[PDB]
Structure formats: structure tokens, C-alpha cells
């Protein structure tokens, strides 16, 4: 069985959604970020990223981690590529060419988009604008590239929803506060709505909503 | 024949090394960073990341890009995973579990090591307060070094007790940190692992070509 370590209000959401798309039963262990807990090492602290039990399985001290048949993996987007390769189905690459493409879009998201995106979710006056207008403009390159790629496509790879769309959608979810950025990239706007209208996404976010902020 | 776009004095070194490890024939197309070039769009300009001809290959305008039978891939570390998977041999994952592990280490390097590593090399290539800004980045890397150090206590390589694409990927990210001698001093197993990776003939041959390019 699959075990997923991490609260839904974290990058673990990427793995909960993927598991849902694949139809996998899983066990959720709601490990909390150590900064959202007042004194992480107290006996009555919630299970968190600085707990020795958790550090024994992910020495990096970050969520998510998943454990599948003894194998522990600790990188959210890569976790998803592994689940797709393992379990197959339409979300998985169908040939070596798609594997390259899916891998390429996933790493592009991780290195060129996520770092700026996540700062916006941290940010979320003239001072609040400048810090956001900086991270917003950074993303113009990324948005433009995806926008052009989606001119004649509904999905990034193989004319169907894949793990590449799922990985990307979750990174781009961090940017949704930037209304203006989406308005000038309508193909990305349409694509992200298309990804988020899926039942397994809805059902992930409903579980997520049950955790206090 | 594989085409690799990018000068060796770039992240394309990662793909040149990998191709060499795999014994793949490739065509090297030098593409420089547009900021190193006086007039990137002028007709006499060397091919660069802002050249329309190149932008038609990789719309992101970054190097490396590899082209394999029409398929264009544009993320150095992931390019190597693709090459390993396609061509096989001992650098490639032998099964789904190793694929998981090799993928995890690669994404860890990309998201958790490289950003700080890059800022070392960018400041170090290009002051009393300057030595303090670097120490901030150096401290952010302690975590990552410690984790790899622990993992290497009783391993010579990160996965499957042999040199794989995960080692090659990590080695190239960690090369960016080599100026930070105190960090390596305090993590002798990482230092020994890096030297072991760099002792390999394909790495030496990649660095020999690299050294021909001006700077
Ligand atoms: N690259 C990792 C990043 C993991 C990560 O940064 N996780 C955060 C939560 S979203 C965390 O656990 N932070 C620990 C803390 O700040 O206390 C991944 O994508 O899984
Ligand atoms: N994340 C990509 C992109 C790497 C990247 O940004 N490369 C640099 C040179 S190593 C570049 O293209 N610079 C061109 C410029 O922006 O001037 C990868 O790892 O392949």
C-alpha cells in the first residue's frame, strides 16, 4: 500500500491528487510543517517535519514523502512521475518520446516556474506590490512559453491530460492570485481551469479544505 | 545523430558528459548566452540564446537543448534521464525502484541544491560584505551536504552501488560549489564521491573540450 506523509495544505497536495487520478488506495499521515507549529520538539507537539520519526524517513525534513513497498521518495513532482511510470494508465507516458516530453515539462516547472510561484504564495501596499510585481514579471517568460505551446493543444503532451499537466497545474495554482497574468495568457487560463475541473482535483481540494489554515 | 546545443561553458557540459559516458555520437552546436554577446540579433553575431534560429528550437531561449530525431528537450538534468532511459547500459535505472531513486536524487539536486550552487558561481566568477553574502548561500547548502554525507557513509555512489546518471547529474550540480573548500572539508564523503565521479574518462574528455573555449 501507498503511504503519503504530509498535510494537504502543502506540496503533498500534488501527490494526493495523483493518487486520486490513479485510483490508488493510500494512507495519509498528516505531518505538519515545523514552522506552522509553535514548539516542534515538545512531547505534545503535532507530528511535524522536525519530529525524529519523520526525519528518519526523510532526512531532508520536508513534505511530501511517499512510501511505496519500502521505497521512500521525497520530491513532490518526481514522486508523481514515478507513480505514473509504476501504475501506468492514460496519465503515464505512452512511449519514450512522451517520457522525454513529460520529464521536460516537469523539470521546467520545477526550475523555471515554481521558485517564483512559491514566493507569491508566501507573499499571499506599494511594498507588497513591488515584491509581487517582481515575481510576477519573472513569470512572464514562462507563461508566454506555455501560452504559445497551448495555441493548438488542450493539454501539454499527447492531446490528453497527463502527469505533466497535473504537475504543472499544481505549480501554476500558486500563481492564481495574479489575476492580470492570467488575463493576458488566456490559453493558460483555459488550460488550468480544464485541469481543475477534474473530479480527483475537486476531491483533493475538499479534503484539503477540512484542515485549518 | 544527437544534436547538442550550447557551449561547454554552460549547463550543456552535463549533456556532453552524459553522451560521452554512453558512447553516443553527437553534433555539438555552440550557442552562447546572449548577455556575453555585444549585439545578439545582428547578422555577424555568434549563435546565441536570443537568435531567432535558436529560439525556433528552444522557445525558452536557454541552453542546453538536445534534439533527437525531431524531439527537442531543454532541461539539462532531465535530458540526461531521457538519454539514460533510451540508451540503457549501467548508468540507467535497472528497474522501477532505481528509476524512483534516480529521479528523486535528480529532482532534489535541481530544486534543493542547484539554486544556491548557481548563486555561489555567479558571485564567485563575477569585498568584505561580498564574503558575507556567500556565507548565507553556503549555510543554505549545509543541509544538503549533510544529507548526502549521511547517505554516502557506506555507499560510493547514490544508487545501486555503481556510477549512474544520478551521480553524473549531482556531480555536475556540486561542481558549481567546488570553490567552497570548507564545506567539502567538513563533508569528506561528499568530497571523495565528487572526486570519484570526476576521475572518470568521459568527464576528463568533456572538461578538455570545455577548456578550449575562451571564457
Ligand atoms: N522540492 C520539495 C520541496 C518540499 C518542501 O519544501 N516542503 C515544505 C512544505 S510545502 C516543507 O516541508 N517545509 C518544512 C518547513 O518549512 O517547516 C518537493 O517538491 O517535495
Ligand atoms: N533549467 C535549464 C536552463 C538552464 C539555463 O538557464 N542555462 C543558461 C546558461 S548555463 C542560459 O541559457 N543562459 C542564457 C541567458 O539567459 O543569457 C537547464 O537546466 O537546462
Q: For domain B93-213, which architecture applies? A: Up-down Bundle (1.20)
Handedness of CA A102, A104, A105, A107 (dihedral sign): positive
Q: What spatial distance separates the first Cα and last Cα of chain B, rounded to whole Å?
A: 28
Q: In CATH terms, is domain A93-211 a member of 1.10.260.40?
A: no
Asked if A81 and B103 come within 8 Å (Cβ–Cβ), the reply is yes
Q: Is residue B54 within 8 Å of B47, Cβ to Cβ?
A: yes
Q: Is residue A176 within 8 Å of A182, Cβ to Cβ?
A: yes
Structure resolution, Å = 2.0
Separation in Å, CA of B204 to nearest CA in chain A? 27
- Judging by DSSP bridges, how do beta strands B26-29 and B65-68 pair with one another? unpaired
**Can you state the angle between helices B76-87 and A96-108, rounded to 10 degrees?**
160
What is d(CA A209, CA B210) in angstroms, rounded to the nearest whole number? 52
What is d(CA B135, CA B128) in angstroms, rounded to the nearest whole number? 11
- Residue of minimum CA distance from atom 6 in ligand 1: A62
What is d(CA B62, CA B32) in angstroms, rounded to the nearest whole number? 9
3-state secondary structure of B101: helix
3-state secondary structure of A42: coil
Q: Of B100, B76, B54, B63, which is closest to residue B168 (Cα–Cα)? A: B76
Strands across the sheet with A71-73, in order? A26-29, A2-5, A65-68, A71-73
Residue B3 β-bridge partners: B27, B67
Distances (CA, A) of B168 to A207, B164, B208, B212: 40, 7, 17, 22
Match 544508487 to its residue by C-alpha cell: B159
Same fold, A1-92 and A93-211: no
What is the number of other CB atoms lying within 10 angstroms of the CB of residue A154? 14
Question: Superfamily assignment of A1-92 in CATH?
Answer: Glutaredoxin (3.40.30.10)
DSSP code of residue A61: -
Distances (CA, A) of A130 to A125, A134, A136, A172, B203: 9, 6, 9, 20, 44
Cell matching residue A131: 515584491
Domain ranges of chain B: 1-92, 93-213
Q: Read out DSSP for A108-129?
A: HIIIIIHHHHHHHHHH--HHHH
| Closest ligand to Cα B64 | 2
What is d(CA A18, CA A24) in angstroms, rounded to the nearest whole number? 9
Within chain B, what is the greatest distance between any pair of CA atoms? Answer: 55
Probe residue for ligand 1, chosen from A51, A62, A167, A168 as the CB with the greatest number of ligand atoms within 8 Å:
A62
3-state secondary structure of A74: coil
- The residue length of chain B stands at 215
- Judging by DSSP bridges, how do beta strands A2-5 and A65-68 pair with one another? antiparallel
- State in Å: Cα B60 to ligand 2 middle: 9
What is the number of other CB atoms lying within 10 angstroms of the CB of residue A80? 27
Measured between beta carbons, which residues in chain B are less than 8 angstroms from residue A110? 107, 110-111
Amino acid at each position: 500500500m501507498l503511504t503519503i506523509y504530509g498535510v494537504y495544505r502543502s506540496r503533498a497536495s500534488r501527490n494526493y491528487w495523483m493518487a486520486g487520478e490513479l485510483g490508488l488506495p493510500f494512507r495519509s499521515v498528516p505531518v505538519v510543517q515545523a514552522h506552522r507549529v509553535a514548539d516542534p520538539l515538545a512531547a505534545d507537539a503535532p507530528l511535524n517535519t522536525k519530529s525524529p520519526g519523520f526525519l528518519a524517513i526523510n532526512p531532508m525534513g520536508l513534505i511530501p514523502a511517499i512510501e511505496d513497498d519500502g521505497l521512500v521518495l521525497t520530491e513532490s513532482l518526481a514522486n508523481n512521475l514515478y507513480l505514473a511510470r509504476k501504475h501506468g494508465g492514460p496519465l503515464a507516458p505512452a512511449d519514450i518520446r512522451e517520457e522525454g516530453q513529460i520529464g521536460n515539462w516537469t523539470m521546467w516547472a520545477a526550475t523555471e516556474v515554481e521558485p517564483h510561484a512559491v514566493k507569491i504564495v508566501l507573499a499571499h501596499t506599494p511594498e507588497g506590490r513591488a515584491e509581487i510585481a517582481a515575481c510576477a514579471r519573472s513569470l512572464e517568460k514562462a507563461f508566454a512559453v506555455l501560452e504559445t505551446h497551448l495555441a493548438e493543444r488542450d493539454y501539454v503532451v499527447g492531446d490528453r491530460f497527463t502527469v505533466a499537466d497535473l504537475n504543472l497545474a499544481e505549480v501554476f495554482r500558486y500563481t492564481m492570485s495574479q489575476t492580470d497574468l492570467f488575463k493576458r495568457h488566456p490559453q493558460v487560463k483555459a488550460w488550468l481551469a480544464r485541469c481543475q475541473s477534474r473530479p480527483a482535483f475537486k476531491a483533493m481540494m475538499e479534503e484539503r479544505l477540512k484542515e485549518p489554515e
